[PDB]
A paper describes a structure:
The Clp protease system is important for maintaining proteostasis in bacteria. The hexameric ATPase ClpC1 utilizes the energy of ATP binding and hydrolysis to engage, unfold, and translocate substrates into the proteolytic chamber of homo- or hetero-tetradecameric ClpP for degradation. Here, we present cryo-EM structures of the substrate-bound ClpC1:shClpP1P2 from Streptomyces hawaiiensis, and shClpP1P2 in complex with ADEP1, a natural compound produced by S. hawaiiensis and known to cause over-activation and dysregulation of the ClpP proteolytic core chamber.
The resulting ClpC1 was used to form a complex with shClpP1P2 in the presence of the supplemented fluorescein-labeled casein substrate and ATP. Two distinct groups of ClpC1:shClpP1P2 were obtained at the resolutions of ~3.0 Å, referred as conformation A and conformation B, respectively. In both conformations of ClpC1:shClpP1P2, the six protomers of ClpC1 are arranged stepwise along a central axis, which is tilted ~18° away from the central axis of the shClpP1P2 chamber, forming a shallow spiral dome structure that is hooked onto the apical surface of shClpP1P2. In conformation A, only five of the six LGF loops are bound to the shClpP2 surface, and two empty shClpP2 pockets are found between the ClpC1 protomers P6 and P2. In conformation B, all six of the LGF loops are mounted on the shClpP2 surface, and only one empty shClpP2 pocket is located between the P1 and P2 protomers of ClpC1.
Numbering used by the authors:
A (entry chain H): 52 to 230
B (entry chain G), C (entry chain F), D (entry chain E), E (entry chain A), F (entry chain B), G (entry chain C): 31 to 208
H (entry chain N), I (entry chain J): 52 to 228
J (entry chain K): 52 to 227
K (entry chain I): 52 to 234
The structure:
């Protein structure tokens, strides 16, 4: 079982849509890794297309609360919440594969049939979510918040070099022989 | 079959019906009937209301068409007149809005849904707020109450029969017979 | 095809049918036919009921439109004529309500459903209370029985033939031949 | 297409068809046709039966309409006349009921279903008992057989032909050629 | 239905009703009506719009048909005139484009989809860009504002009621009570 | 209906529409209309095209009928003339093919999937190649742009915008206000 | 209504269409039209086959009607004449069978499906073989080719253009501006 | 699996909606944890979006009956019944993450087709459930019952600091220094 | 289970239709059997109603590649792909049960909607598949190749003796010796 | 599970429809049971409502191949393929329960749309299958092949005594 | 379990459609095999009918990242993305079965309904992915990039020897061959 061996070396895979079950599993694994060793690095690999905002906030808070440094590595794609999780790693320890893509855009949501007051409350809530999103993106990046708002207006796709210049990641690792 | 002929001849006399929920095609047909009847600018048009409401824009088109013609319109509520059906019932000329003794009238705020990105949701939400306040001000103007009183009343659905409807300004009088 | 022609020819003889369950469309059609036949006031209108019930508001609209006109209405029952069909059967002109010998009648309380938030559920519950007690009062007034008697009787399904109908007070006579 | 005008002509020569299972719609059709043709009190009416059954209430309505008018009715079986079809076939005036030489006649006591609470189930069960006895005594009266014999024969699904139909009393004669 | 004869009679007065999700069928119907009415060049053609938009290629055919004929087109808006329905409303002759009070107008950019290989996707995307810039430049030409102003305004979503639509240039004047 | 009436009145003026995808029944309808109008030989027939194309064999039937009668056919493109609708657009008599100013024309190779056994697949594939070559040479003859150029341009979808279609030779003139 | 009207005039002009797959309904249609036109023994009937085949029994019915009415049947292929439609194409009187220049023709052996017990399978298989032999010999009789030539050419499939069909003997001549 | 370990150190997740199965599992784990050790604390972490009222009442009663103190932690969100379980923990030991939310609103329910009397009985039960809901909310909150009644008329979303000010929680986690 | 034992004595069952997963499992078992003992023969039992062509080619290649001799037994039926798999065994070791049917026919395939160029490419591909199939049938049989061409035009069903005379089966087993 | 236990008491059930998977399972079980002990008999219990013909053929050949005697017991019903499988046992070992029904009928087949040649080939194949079925029924019973051919024209149901008179079974067992 | 025996001998087996889960499993297995021994080669067997592009890219990057040489064996077919993986092995150790095919074509994709700007962004992304695929195919082969661009316009099917001539593979296996055994 390769996943068990990976977990034995403090490595966590996130290659599924970010929902409640996956968030709970990730948080439980993070708590176990902290309990077994509170002062050694934890590696998180991201290959997910995105997910719900509440699970994203839960995972982000769990990563921030847990004190050992978290090294985030992007392998395939990191879109929406996956980009935020990738940028939420320890500075200097955020990496991406040479051929990878990072996708950022403003949140999208659906609501059911309802009266105007409920719709207004939902609109206020989603605007609050979006504002929290720009705050989270600006905190862990080297880009002004106004540029963040202008960029995440539509779908923004960045390669490894574009992400490195954009501040989400810190290194592009080519091979193993060439350190 | 029979419905076509009876509706045709009733339209010939003076009569127009709204016995179904308000939507695009029924609004178009009612507007066409009103425009055709407006050719003779002396007689009045009797409109019977029995519907649980409908789309906002179609009701707005019917209301605007009613206000556009100089012919008097006599709205009569029968069976049920709720949501936009009530609004079109009260939109008739003053002193010629009536309801049946066993009729019921319901009022409540509009409803809709939201979909899309945050910017589009915000735009649609502000559009909905503007529409809601527009409906509040028009219903207050046509009923005789104040804007704020109607705003408090139209938070949840409220029911009336003919009597508190007529003393509430929704309707002018009630006939048991012709 | 043939149905339209035969219905039109019977309408030329001031005969109105109320088969199949009552709904908004049939209510509007019956109202249109009644308003058409109201053109000549010194005539009678014969109505035949074979409906197993229908919408509350549509039935109230039909009943109030029937009371609106001056023409005497003769209700004739065959088949089932249950629920709202029974109510419209007994709502005719006094002394002009008839049932065929093999014509069942059923009486029971209204039924509906509730959904939404707690406040809206309470509002709808009190509205259903108002409607049910109004129905009981109208039934007691038309049949001549006691309000409490009818309220107690109409807790479950209650069945009558023509006879228990006539000694109950729902109808006034049983027609065997012409 | 052709059905409209062929039925118009057949109605002109006073021919009525019931070639389908009996429901509310065809019940209203037959009742309307009989009422329209009742305007002439001296000429008789011809009705043919090709049906596999129907509903109880519609059959009762049609039967009551048949016995309501003064005009004589000739019921002719056209092959399959089962359940309610044969009852409407045997409900014609005595001495004027016929069946085609190759015809099938079937009698069986009615069937239904029950759903609801225990008290409601009991009420519908006693209703079914009363209507079953109603049917049994009515067919015993019309066919000239004893109540017990009819009840015994109606429990199972006994079949008949034209010869057994006339000797049992279901029909009066077998019509071949004109 | 009554709609057919009422539409025929109103079309006899050179009044054209529009407003449905615009597709090939309604566009063909409108173009046929315009071509038929184009027989008499010196009479105006009234065109009423209440629609949420439709396909681009059909509305463009309607626009070309209107610009083809000699007859002046007087466009009237009520209820909702959104998406490319707004474009067709603004396509009318100058000084003859009106909207009723409380009639909503909406502008936004076109929408489409992609499917296929890379080459086909590229070709269709460049076609969509050309169509979008053509729509923007035509809207700027008709309204009077600059191309860049329309491009900035019609990016996400933009709503209007009667008066700011009038001052913007979408509507020449707002008519009420003839 | 209203559409039927306007189509009849336009057919009295020798005007034909193709505002739907090409298939069996519509091709038969167009062929019937052309054969009916071919009674008078010295008159020309106007043919409006707005279609995304359709079946091959039906369009070949329409094209053969167009080339069969002695009457001249004036083809007018409105909306879009995509795929094989363009083929029928360019099949008109020389000097009498036109497109409205806001018209888009699309050209691409035929596409029709295949399945079955190996030999049947081979037969269908060689027929597809043969009919593709036939279409290429036919459109080359009707546009005068050689065969190799047409085959090169038919590999993928290509778009033309009135004037581009004019210079390419697909049409003869871009009509304005007559 | 337009299609029915143009078909009315074409039938008045002795023109018949088969532009759809052949089944029992269209078989009755064609037989009825041919029988109606057979009242004139000195005139001929024009036939416009373009169909992708159909049912065997319907085709036999139409073929027998063609050989029965004693009138000359002029058969024309316009689009695709395949399977059974090809057989109907050659069923016309000699010297009066034509195909348009771009018409394309198909021949192949019959196909069907079988299910049931072994004896039923054997009976159906031998009937399929018998009807295949009948089709082959009828085709070899109508077209000047031997039975072996047809039974090997129709082994899997074969296609034909206008001139290849003309030289093969399927048709007599092609039209061009005729 | 991490879940087994966290159960070894007395941890219960609530990451699904509140229903009969989840409530029954919560019963089983709470009773077993109390039986194994009635002295140490029991931690309940909630990430539920809501659920039925009967499971709400049953789980609340079980938590109250279980005499060891119960800590409650709101990790991702707490809507409707989840907020009630968040407030139902041992006072002084109710926690929420920084970027978390708590949603409160009056119960929503529907009834099937039936006669007026059955609908009245159902409506009376619905009103009783609602009254029990605001009573239980006021019991574990520092706000007046009238304020709760007016606030839960429609949906209400509060951040971690807003929940702390409202009395739903006691501490707002920041980080592990 | 009997399946594990039958694997232990170097017998592989092919009882389901030939797809990607089944072919992958069969070739993995073949590789393991070759590794464990590169001299003892491997027995393959054919009871499949055909399958995809790519899996056919993969199994055929991995069966011709392995050093140990392949002993193929037709069991029940062997249609299309199964017929080729049965006939691809080591000469003198391809046998069938007494009552059995071997069905051979040209490949059948379906192509989705697409432009003419894609359809003619697919037609070339299916013609190449048919040519490869008939060449493989000719290589492992005594029947002349043109005879196979005319035979596989339609369905051809052969009994055990018909297959033996055709050149696909070496001998027929009746009873255990 | 009792199935594995009854497997080491050398009893094999056939209580499901006779398809490819069940046929392969039964064939593997028979091979393994012969491997374990090539001298003791193998018991086959039949409770199947028929199945495909290919599975019938495979199981028949497998039973006929091995030395160990195939002792066939029938409970409840043995229709179509199951009847042939029961009659295919070693002589003297075919016994059935008192009130058990055995149904015999000609094979039923269904094919999709196809050309005439394909349907003719399918008809020839199904006729060959019916002929083979009649051949096995004749060689494994006492009734002459002509009466068997005439009997399978329509479905025929036989009791245990009727089956014994027909010749498919050897003796009827009621209670040990 | 034959798959476990194959894994213990350092063979990674890919016989399903390439998606996120399969890519994650392949990357995890490759990392574990590299950790076990950074010197012994790793064998990858390909029987996949193509798949997604992001998973292809992740697998390709992981293959190029690990220290040991990768030995790719085409086995059955390599339809859309599996061909790149076959061509991405260590040069000189990319082989194929005799009766196998390798297919190459430009990527196919579709997008949901949206505004024109979103479609333009999606088209730009798809063109970028196509250019990346052409670059990866040109780097790991012999034919020039222009030939690749011309060829991948439509579905191109190559046999074993056709692939060897194209340069995607290096050897075609025929039969098991014993070692020299010369002491």
């Amino acid at each position: 079982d390769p996943y068990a061996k990976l977990f034995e070396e403090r490595v966590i895979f996130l290659g599924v849509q970010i929902d409640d079950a996956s968030a709970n599993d990730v948080m439980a694994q993070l708590l176990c890794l902290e309990s077994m060793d509170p002062d050694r690095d934890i590696s998180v690999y991201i290959n997910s297309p995105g997910g719900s905002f509440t699970a994203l906030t839960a995972i982000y808070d769990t990563m921030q609360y847990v004190k050992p440094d978290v090294q985030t590595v992007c392998m395939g794609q990191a879109a929406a919440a996956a980009a935020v999780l990738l940028a939420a790693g320890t500075p200097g320890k955020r990496m991406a594969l040479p051929n990878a893509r990072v996708l950022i855009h403003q949140p999208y949501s659906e609501t059911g049939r309802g009266q105007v007051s409920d719709l207004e409350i939902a609109a206020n809530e989603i605007l609050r979510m979006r504002s929290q999103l720009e705050d989270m993106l600006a905190k862990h990046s080297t880009t002004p918040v106004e540029k963040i708002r202008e960029d995440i207006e539509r779908d923004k796709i960045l390669t490894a070099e574009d992400a490195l210049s954009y501040g989400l990641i810190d290194q592009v690792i080519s091979t193993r022989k060439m350190d | 079959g029979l419905g076509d002929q009876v509706y045709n001849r009733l339209l010939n006399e003076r009569i127009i019906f709204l016995g179904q929920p308000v939507d695009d095609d029924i609004a178009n047909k009612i507007t066409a009937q009103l425009l055709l009847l407006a050719s003779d600018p002396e007689k009045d048009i009797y409109l019977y209301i029995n519907s649980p409401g409908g789309s906002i824009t179609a009701g707005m088109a019917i209301y605007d068409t009613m206000q556009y013609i100089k012919n008097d319109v006599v709205t009569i509520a029968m069976g049920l007149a709720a949501a936009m059906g009530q609004f079109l019932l009260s939109a008739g000329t003053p002193g010629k809005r009536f309801a049946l003794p066993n009729a019921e009238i319901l009022i409540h705020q509009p409803s809709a849904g939201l979909a899309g990105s945050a910017s589009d949701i915000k735009i649609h939400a502000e559009r909905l707020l503007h529409t809601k306040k527009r409906m509040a001000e028009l219903t207050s103007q046509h009923t005789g109450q104040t804007i704020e009183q109607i705003t408090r009343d139209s938070d949840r659905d409220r029911w009336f029969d003919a009597f508190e409807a007529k003393e509430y300004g929704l309707i002018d009088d009630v006939m048991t017979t012709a």
